[PDB]
Amino acid sequence: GHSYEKYNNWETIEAWTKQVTSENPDLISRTAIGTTFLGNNIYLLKVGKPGPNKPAIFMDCGFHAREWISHAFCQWFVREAVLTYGYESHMTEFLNKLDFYVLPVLNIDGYIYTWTKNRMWRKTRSTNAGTTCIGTDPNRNFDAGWCTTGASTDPCDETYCGSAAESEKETKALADFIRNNLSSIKAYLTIHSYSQMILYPYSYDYKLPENNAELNNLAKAAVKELATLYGTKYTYGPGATTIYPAAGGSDDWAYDQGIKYSFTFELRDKGRYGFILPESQIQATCEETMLAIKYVTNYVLGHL
Ligand SMILES: CCCCC[C@H](NC(=O)OCc1ccccc1)P(=O)(O)O[C@H](C(=O)O)c1cccc(NC(=N)N)c1
Numbered sequence: 001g002h003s004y005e006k007y008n009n010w011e012t013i014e015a016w017t018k019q020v021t022s023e024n025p026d027l028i029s030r031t032a033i034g035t036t037f038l039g040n041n042i043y044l045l046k047v048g049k050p051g052p053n054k055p056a057i058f059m060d061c062g063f064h065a066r067e068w069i070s071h072a073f074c075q076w077f078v079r080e081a082v083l084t085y086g087y088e089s090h091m092t093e094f095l096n097k098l099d100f101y102v103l104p105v106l107n108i109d110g111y112i113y114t115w116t117k118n119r120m121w122r123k124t125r126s127t128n129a130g131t132t133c134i135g136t137d138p139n140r141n142f143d144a145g146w147c148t149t150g151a152s153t154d155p156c157d158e159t160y161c162g163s164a165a166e167s168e169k170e171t172k173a174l175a176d177f178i179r180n181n182l183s184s185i186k187a188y189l190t191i192h193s194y195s196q197m198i199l200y201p202y203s204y205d206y207k208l209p210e211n212n213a214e215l216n217n218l219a220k221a222a223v224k225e226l227a228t229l230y231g232t233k234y235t236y237g238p239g240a241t242t243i244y245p246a247a248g249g250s251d252d253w254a255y256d257q258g259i260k261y262s263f264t265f266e267l268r269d270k271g272r273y274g275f276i277l278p279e280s281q282i283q284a285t286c287e288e289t290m291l292a293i294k295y296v297t298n299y300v301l302g303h304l
């Protein structure tokens, strides 16, 4: 069965996407935006009160297989939305005015692999010509200074950038969806762990986004809000200098598509447990993260 305070396997998450949609048809619609290399369905939940030409915020989880708290957060977010709509003024306003496009798990094949074989797997699970080595790093696989830095051209490496940008079915599917909905998508949020950071562009170069001052102010406010709940300390800044240079990331790509608010979130913790964050921290992690995501949403709505 599904639990919001446990890590759920794909079969359970999949069944959950069907159930939560079935139970909340006036707030959620479910679509598939493609298949993974191994034929799993890439679900996308449109969360919001339906209406004509609404703006949207896009959020994905589960880019990286081992970052289990990421997957947990997208599920937590959806429950919070449906439970508090009509009762909490901000979320009610949010869902009335815009849609959240929530992609609960992008790298499903890798996620399944962390459940069945290797808890520390990162990449996709696609085959590579000429080698037995498996998988591409999905966050090195986007058309953003592709493979020029912080990436490997070797399929045996953890940051393999792929044979070409969007060579992976999963990243192609995500990019296709965002490109098809650029007129509506006002912010892109991609959830990772760990490090307790909010990053904005750029990572593929040391150059700064034109609205750099705005993004720094937004991230600064978001981390302050997050800390109010349990005192959790986040840092923030442009990817390249705040964590490390790395090309081919979806946050940079999305920004260069014209989505002016693009953030990579790195959730708890700081390395005590690392990727193996205890289930006992799921609820607190998700609760404080909700505050930061809602703050960003409120800001974006006031700047349409
Ligand atoms: C403190 C340890 C965890 C740090 C964050 C994670 N990084 C990570 O696992 O790197 C692993 C690795 C790095 C180098 C060699 C081998 C393995 P991540 O969630 O994979 O980090 C993202 C990534 O590298 O794709 C990330 C973090 C911040 C910004 C961006 N954006 C971007 N365009 N690179 C991307």
Ligand SMILES: [Zn+2]
Residues within 6 Å of the ligand: 063, 064, 067, 192, 193
């Ligand atoms: Zn990651």
